[PDB]
Amino acid sequence: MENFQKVEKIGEGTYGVVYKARNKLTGEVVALKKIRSTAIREISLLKELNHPNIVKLLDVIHTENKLYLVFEFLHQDLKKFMDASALTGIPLPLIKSYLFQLLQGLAFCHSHRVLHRDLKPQNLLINTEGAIKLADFGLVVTLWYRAPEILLGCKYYSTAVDIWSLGCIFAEMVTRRALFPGDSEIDQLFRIFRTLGTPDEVVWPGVTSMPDYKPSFPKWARQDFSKVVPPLDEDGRSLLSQMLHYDPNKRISAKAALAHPFFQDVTKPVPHLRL
Numbered sequence: 001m002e003n004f005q006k007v008e009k010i011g012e013g014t015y016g017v018v019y020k021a022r023n024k025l026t027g028e029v030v031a032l033k034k035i036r037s038t039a040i041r042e043i044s045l046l047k048e049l050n051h052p053n054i055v056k057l058l059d060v061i062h063t064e065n066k067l068y069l070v071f072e073f074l075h076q077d078l079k080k081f082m083d084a085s086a087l088t089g090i091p092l093p094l095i096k097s098y099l100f101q102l103l104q105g106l107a108f109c110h111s112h113r114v115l116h117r118d119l120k121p122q123n124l125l126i127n128t129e130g131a132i133k134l135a136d137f138g139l140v141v142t143l144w145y146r147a148p149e150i151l152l153g154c155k156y157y158s159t160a161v162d163i164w165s166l167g168c169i170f171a172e173m174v175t176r177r178a179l180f181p182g183d184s185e186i187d188q189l190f191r192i193f194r195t196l197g198t199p200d201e202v203v204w205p206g207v208t209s210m211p212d213y214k215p216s217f218p219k220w221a222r223q224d225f226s227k228v229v230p231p232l233d234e235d236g237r238s239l240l241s242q243m244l245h246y247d248p249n250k251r252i253s254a255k256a257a258l259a260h261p262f263f264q265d266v267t268k269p270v271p272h273l274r275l
């Protein structure tokens with residue numbers, strides 16, 4: 001520290017606060033995450049994880065107890081953007097450009113066996129150029145984007161949890177209302193089951209053996225995708241249902257998703273934003 005002037009608190013992060021600040025010497029505006037040995041380690045791989053779709057971890061000043069993370073500074077997050085576009089909605093070409101880049105980022109860190117684990121509109125940042133970046137990785141909290149295997153007690157979940165979370169984000173950008181706005185784990189799970197149908201050994205081998213599966217869960221039918229994501233076209237739905245498959249193994253990878261016919265016509269338009 002001491003070389004940074006906390007300009008303004010801009011949020012509450014995963015394990016610490018986040019401030020907008022000037023590098024008292026450089027003059028450049030940056031983003032700080034203040035937080036509360038194995039750690040420093042997982043952070044090392046983070047500095048050498050450069051991709052146009054991942055926020056840039058600039059420095060890591062570890063000065064006695066308090067540990068700071070210095071990131072490049074981004075213009076705005078996706079929740080705010082969505083909030084600001086609620087009356088008209090986000091134009092498809094843009095919704096499409098963003099999904100494409102995000103999948104590019106995911107494909108990248110999945111290659112390096114790094115998962116995000118907590119993907120959401122608030123952990124996605126954008127700039128005036130039309131780029132979107134994945135932010136705040138992992139190791140009154142929200143559960144709407146939780147994959148079903150995590151809610152069922154799987155302790156060794158894969159990179160597929162991210163595809164699921166992205167799947168939920170995709171739908172929300174198209175319909176403008178969260179897909180599964182649960183308020184408790186069991187509530188979350190039931191909203192999922194009431195839409196995609198209650199999973200059984202047929203669609204999810206091993207599901208009934210999961211730590212938190214109860215033979216007593218109600219048995220709901222699976223709802224038509226025409227009703228769930230109405231304005232989305234058929235290519236969009238193919239993809240959405242493949243990102244939302246119960247079985248983590250049959251759930252589509254980031255790599256494959258990038259080749260889905262839904263992206264044939266993907267362009268890179270710029271957003272109109274109020275900073």
Ligand SMILES: N[C@H]1CC[C@H](Nc2nc(NCc3ccccc3)c3ncn(C4CCCC4)c3n2)CC1
Nearest residue numbers: 010011012013014018031071073074075076135136
């Ligand atoms: N869980 C989340 C908690 C809040 C955190 N927010 C947040 N907001 C940013 N910009 C938004 C902005 C713009 C203008 C005024 C006010 C705010 C930002 N830029 C880099 N970071 C990093 C620091 C962390 C990495 C990204 C940011 N984190 C993001 C993570």
